[PDB]
Amino acid sequence: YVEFEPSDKHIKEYLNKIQNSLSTEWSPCSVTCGNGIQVRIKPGSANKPKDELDYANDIEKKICKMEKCPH
Numbered sequence: 001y002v003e004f005e006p007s008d009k010h011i012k013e014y015l016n017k018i019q020n021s022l023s024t025e026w027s028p029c030s031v032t033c034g035n036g037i038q039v040r041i042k043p044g045s046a047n048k049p050k051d052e053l054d055y056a057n058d059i060e061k062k063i064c065k066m067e068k069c070p071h
């Protein structure tokens with residue numbers, strides 16, 4: 001059945017996109033309408049170099065919901 005949840009592959013793609021602004025503050029929502037994701041570096045991982053961020057443990061993720069997508 002369709003999951004209707006964001007996928008890890010897609011969240012990782014977003015991480016690539018916003019990597020220059022990635023911080024311990026929540027990122028912008030990945031979408032301007034519908035459902036997307038926001039990500040941030042976990043506060044306890046702020047000291048880590050970019051190349052040692054573990055997806056599961058060092059990155060936090062939350063669903064964000066914008067207004068319905070228009071036709």
Ligand SMILES: [Pt+2]
Nearest residue numbers: 029065066067
């Ligand atoms: Pt929104």
